[PDB]
Subunit: 158 residues, 4 copies
């Protein structure tokens, strides 16, 4: 059966490039892959249900970025992929800027065979110990809106 | 601040032993610990609600250890956050999925909060490989239901779906 | 084929109890184990060559504590166990008190399928960040002779 | 002090990509990095001896990244220790074993120094499972010998011993 690896951590944690590390292993192994993102080729989809459109009978790897943005229906969708022998690799955020769990990421962490926690550089103190995202301006965006911080700095800042 | 470590995996994956390894590091390092379990031996306080923990944590407590977290109220998520913010490291061990492969919610919340996650494997009861990630029930389709070998077996995904 | 897991870190890192976590998985799985230590049952042996005396045709797990003290001949001995389908789990020290590599542990880390790095509590600063052992009085012994420290404290102390 | 992370595994296990993920974290965090490679693109300095590194590390360097460490002189062990003691985090990627399953000594020394070790898997060239841990040579029984797909293949232990 397939194995599920979940990569997670705050923003600016190298999660996408880490997921791409796995994509490269499969392509190098001459294995068929399917890559997804929410709204080589990454298929932009909106619902998890839509992945079965793009999965082939010889698809071996399925890679999903930004999993926080998907419906929790992804849990059961991933489970079925695993039961078919398809390896799944997911990246996304574990917590919101309010330190509430992203529900979909949480379900996947529970399902995972392996979990990789990535850290970022703390925006405030400059150490390689950042595990949280602080919001400074669901809301898409980047360094103009979110910074990565350690727990100590978060608490000093909010 | 404190870090949170979560140890998870199916039954029979040596999760309690793993947690006790960490208790030991703090016991050898001269630090006050609190060990808790829900309503596995070193003087664990038995507690019903997570907020009952505050009572047992003194000003010099440096580590808080919690077994079988799947049985705790999800309000554990906020209680753990508070300890972390106070500089208390927390180590948790629990089951990640039920026998029906549904997530345990308290466990899943703590997984999202964790700084480090240790996923543990068990021996597959049917095939005997070191690859079992799921717990199958074998003697009631109730999700919360105490027991040992007489009621639950650890399996890999393939043997799970074969036995289902 | 077998898989090799190596547990390592400084003294007072919970390495023995972690190795025993694995021993318990096999015994619970009703699997035959063989446990070793250098000079349930742990067989006290002096050389790696002596392990083949105690390994059965249905031995599935082989557990080796204090691997720093074994001859580097253990590398090839472990390799052959793996090729036979026997899972191997080893614990021991990565560095001496002078921060020189323990040669046998180093060879095993290179062979390992999984490496677990354990930390201890720093004797000087009290944080859970100790990765080194400082000597304060090959030389067997314990807390009367060695303490665990973080790199910063080691360097302050030596 | 600085921490050392070592990424290792056989060929085709995405080790360089893994290392670049860490380079990125420091690039997004506004910190000076130094990337090095022996005599894989972001402006890596090409160096013959490890001690040639000192030249390229300025007073505000917070991370030092080294690809293909198996090719460096073992005197890298002492050079890395010095950076760590100076508060510079170091990330290293290299092969753990030769094609004959002998350890690479520079890699093994750094493995013992590491605070964190990331073991990476490749796809097995023969069986196609996500479980390959070894590199087999397929086109000279020399241990140090440059090449790609034309000369080395990644395999699991079973397929290695089958092809041997
Ligand atoms: C941290 C966080 C990020 N995001 C978004 C911002 C980014 O576009 C994306 C993470 O790359 O997630 C939220 O919607 N909410 C949050 O709380
Ligand atoms: C797997 C599983 C275990 N349990 C119990 C069995 C044990 O008494 C305890 C696990 O240590 O969890 C449940 O209540 N439901 C389940 O689905
Ligand atoms: C750290 C260290 C430990 N040891 C011994 C002390 C203990 O008896 C054993 C580790 O438990 O190793 C050495 O011989 N040399 C060293 O440098
Ligand atoms: C596996 C292996 C690789 N190499 C080289 C091949 C590549 O040029 C480089 C790995 O990135 O290492 C050796 O020199 N010897 C070996 O045994
Ligand atoms: Zn900070
Ligand atoms: Zn099985
Ligand atoms: Zn210290
Ligand atoms: Zn193979």
């Amino acid at each position: 059966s397939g194995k599920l690896t979940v990569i997670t951590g705050p923003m600016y944690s190298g999660k996408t490039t880490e997921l791409l590390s796995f994509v490269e292993i499969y392509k190098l192994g001459k294995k068929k892959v399917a890559v997804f993102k929410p709204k080589v080729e990454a298929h932009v989809i909106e619902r998890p249900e839509e992945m079965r459109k793009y999965i082939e009978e010889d698809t071996r790897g399925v890679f999903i970025d930004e999993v926080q943005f998907f419906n929790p229906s992804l849990f059961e969708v991933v489970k079925d992929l695993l039961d078919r022998g398809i390896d799944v690799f997911c990246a996304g955020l574990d917590l919101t800027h309010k330190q509430n769990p992203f529900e979909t990421t949480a379900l996947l962490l529970s399902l995972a065979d392996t979990v990789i926690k990535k850290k970022a550089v703390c925006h405030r103190c400059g150490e390689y110990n950042a595990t949280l995202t602080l919001k400074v301006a669901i809301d898409v965006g980047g360094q103009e809106k979110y910074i990565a911080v350690c727990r100590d700095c978060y608490n000093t800042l909010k």
